[PDB]
Amino acid sequence: SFEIPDDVPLPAGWEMAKTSSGQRYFLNHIDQTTTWQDPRKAMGGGGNYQGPPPPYPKH
Numbered sequence: 001s002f003e004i005p006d007d008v009p010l011p012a013g014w015e016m017a018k019t020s021s022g023q024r025y026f027l028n029h030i031d032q033t034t035t036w037q038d039p040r041k042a043m044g045g046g047g048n049y050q051g052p053p054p055p056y057p058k059h
Contacts, residue, residue: 010039027056
């Protein structure tokens with residue numbers, strides 16, 4: 001139950017970013033991909049997102 005701290009950066013090579021301009025997601029510099037969910041997640045819940053997340057925006 002370790003209180004989840006909202007002041008803790010994402011994993012390694014991660015960076016919160018937004019899509020072309022409207023959906024917030026998390027970039028992955030390790031797997032060179034993006035994320036509709038926050039890495040600070042755990043277990044599972046369910047639900048669909050805005051579709052498949054493309055590779056974070058170049059640069």
